Copies of this chain bind each other. A is one copy, B any other.
Amino acid sequence: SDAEIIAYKLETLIETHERGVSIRRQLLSKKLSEPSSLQYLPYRDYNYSLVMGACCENVIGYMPIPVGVAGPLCLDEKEFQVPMATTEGCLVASTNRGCRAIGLGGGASSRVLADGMTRGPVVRLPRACDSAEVKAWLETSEGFAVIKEAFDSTSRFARLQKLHTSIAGRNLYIRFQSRSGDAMGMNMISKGTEKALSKLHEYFPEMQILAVSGNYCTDKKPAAINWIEGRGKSVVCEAVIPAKVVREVLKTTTEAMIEVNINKNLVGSAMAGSIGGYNAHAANIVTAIYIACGQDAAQNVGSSNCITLMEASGPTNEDLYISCTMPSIEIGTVGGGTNLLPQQACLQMLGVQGACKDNPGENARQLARIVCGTVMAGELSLMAALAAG
């Protein structure tokens, strides 16, 4: 009976997933200064089977995030209705206005420049001379192949690319980079890396593997390395907004937009000492789409890297040319939070849910292009509001 059972060791004891959640809440309530705190924290009628043992632990319910829609987004001759999970007012409306200006401008074009999730472990040799020897070995075409072999043998999608190594005395940081089908790829690349390091330990028995991640990836921390070499998907997007569209939809001029972009996104960011933060609010857009689509929201740290550029275009130089370059969009359409039904619905809205069996990785690339496009719409709108004052 309910009261007779009277934490994580609940789903294993009982049988029904919701029962265990309900018991944990009642248990928790006794340990709080306000037992009625959880009154308004919903938990009923939720599919906990997909969550248990894959996405969360010690579950006591779920947090509802308002989902809005911005669009249509005219990108690469297609139209997208973009789902955005946010609690910030004006965000969805503002982004929507941006999409409008792009559509009335003939749409936006985007390109995926690079694709590759990374993992940067740190190993240490007894002496720097030894670590230097390993670096040189890793750089020989013969040393690389054996490493790519041990790395690729862990998965169908594990296809190791370039190897970026860096030395700090007897320490050696190795940045592994590989595609990962339609998955964001963190778990996959970690597995490949472990196998690859094990193989390297056989050639250099004196090598000590200090940590599978030595912050050289770099994952969820700001880093110049992600900005300069990319991580995940590097994307670029562009569009031209007609002078009339800038005055009527955005309520400003091409000249004012350009002056704000240069002195805010370029000079202002420079004065603030920014690395990769040469935009107005890409993070707002990235975060909203990530939460709605089951992405890892903590990856918004590097995923939001962006340089927004604006310039006079057209016959009379009265048209607004805009481009957004995002070198490190960490994203996926398979695994993690994308395995849940509500987030899968948002992914389906964009036509990128799950794997693309015929062209592996295409769904994730499409999603990355959508994010870059939506960021551009968001940048257009906020810059206009700042310019119009």
Contact = CB atoms under 8 A, between A and B. Distances in A.
Contacts of A325: 128, 167-169
B65 A63 contact: yes
Given A58-B96, A63-B85, 20 more contacts: A8-B93, A37-B346, A40-B342, A40-B344, A54-B89, A55-B87, A59-B66, A167-B236, A168-B270, A168-B271, A168-B323, A210-B264, A213-B280, A215-B269, A215-B277, A218-B269, A218-B272, A220-B284, A271-B307, A284-B298
Interface string A34-54: 101111111000100001011
Contacts of A86: 55-56, 297
Contacts of A63: 64-67, 85, 291-292, 342-343, 346
> Main secondary structure on chain A at its contact with chain B?
mixed
Given A63-B292, A68-B58, A297-B287, A274 B224 contact: yes
Contacts of A127: 109, 238
A215 to B, nearest CB: 3
A171 interface: yes
Contacts of A58: 68-70, 92-93, 96
A10 interface: no
Interface stretch (A25-33, A146-154, A241-249, A355-363): A25-33
A387 to B, nearest CB: 7
Nearest to A269: B215
Contacts of A96: 8, 57-58
B57 A62 contact: no
Interface in A329-349: 336-337, 340-346, 348-349
